[PDB]
Design a protein around this ligand. Sequence first.
Ligand SMILES: *[C@@H]1O[C@H](CO)[C@@H](O[C@@H]2O[C@H](CO)[C@@H](O)[C@H](O)[C@H]2NC(C)=O)[C@H](O)[C@H]1NC(C)=O
Ligand SMILES: *[C@@H]1O[C@H](CO)[C@@H](O)[C@H](O)[C@H]1NC(C)=O
Ligand SMILES: *[C@@H]1O[C@H](CO)[C@@H](O)[C@H](O)[C@H]1NC(C)=O
Ligand SMILES: *[C@@H]1O[C@H](CO)[C@@H](O)[C@H](O)[C@H]1NC(C)=O
Ligand SMILES: *[C@@H]1O[C@H](CO)[C@@H](O)[C@H](O)[C@H]1NC(C)=O
Lengths: 106, 47, 52
Amino acid sequence: ERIVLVDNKCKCARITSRIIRSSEDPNEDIVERNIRIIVPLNNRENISDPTSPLRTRFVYHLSDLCKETCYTYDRNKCYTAVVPLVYGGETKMVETALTPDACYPD
Amino acid sequence: VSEEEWNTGETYTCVVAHEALPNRVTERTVDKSTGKPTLYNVSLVMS
Amino acid sequence: VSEEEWNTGETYTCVVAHEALPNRVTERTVDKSTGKPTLYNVSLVMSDTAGT
Ligand SMILES: *[C@@H]1O[C@H](CO)[C@@H](O[C@@H]2O[C@H](CO)[C@@H](O)[C@H](O)[C@H]2NC(C)=O)[C@H](O)[C@H]1NC(C)=O
Ligand SMILES: *[C@@H]1O[C@H](CO)[C@@H](O)[C@H](O)[C@H]1NC(C)=O
Ligand SMILES: *[C@@H]1O[C@H](CO)[C@@H](O)[C@H](O)[C@H]1NC(C)=O
Ligand SMILES: *[C@@H]1O[C@H](CO)[C@@H](O)[C@H](O)[C@H]1NC(C)=O
Ligand SMILES: *[C@@H]1O[C@H](CO)[C@@H](O)[C@H](O)[C@H]1NC(C)=O
């Protein structure tokens, strides 16, 4: 029986807990808080704006996410950044999708 | 008490005096690590 | 070759000529970064907790 305390989707923290049960006796059960953080290793300060360089710092405040920028992309919401595309002398300002198969129109 | 004094790890004994006690007092000591030994299962995956 | 030559990145290609080969030439490359299994630099800090 694993209970999920909090879960920040775009940070991918997944703070969970479970009470392991030993033989019946005066209480010696080990309470544990189990987290599973997926570091990107390739994302930027903005995951949407390509101009920002690679981010080395990886900040994970547990209390801040239990209750802004983050590292992991989401599969539900869209990340759209404005991008310039030029054909000839003039230019047209167009949208783009940073990641594929995430929130394509249906 | 101030939190910085708590972070220093004082004895912080609570002496309770009563007639029924065999020695007429009884105190307990709290500390920064007075509870479980708190063993860590820390792991780091690089798959 | 000198050691300092090996320290610097050089192709140092080896060419083998034989009639039985399809293109008759076999080329192989080697340098300082050839092979070199990945080096890990785990520098972990754990004493900042100080027992909660
Ligand atoms: C890097 O992150 C900053 C965070 O503030 C962003 O700047 C603004 O982000 C909001 C979020 O959608 C946009 O509506 C604004 O248009 C952004 N500002 C500008 C000037 O574009 C943005 O993602 C990045 N910063 C910049 C300067 O591009
Ligand atoms: C921590 O260990 C327990 C086993 O006692 C396991 O059930 C749990 O999944 C582990 N946590 C994570 C994040 O894998
Ligand atoms: C860490 O310590 C606990 C306490 O005994 C142990 O159960 C666990 O297996 C240890 N982790 C590893 C990787 O051995
Ligand atoms: C965590 O500790 C438990 C002991 O209850 C152990 O069985 C488990 O393998 C540990 N988790 C690891 C080593 O990832
Ligand atoms: C390995 O880590 C140590 C400790 O942080 C550091 O001093 C050293 O420069 C590192 N070696 C590298 C990055 O090649």
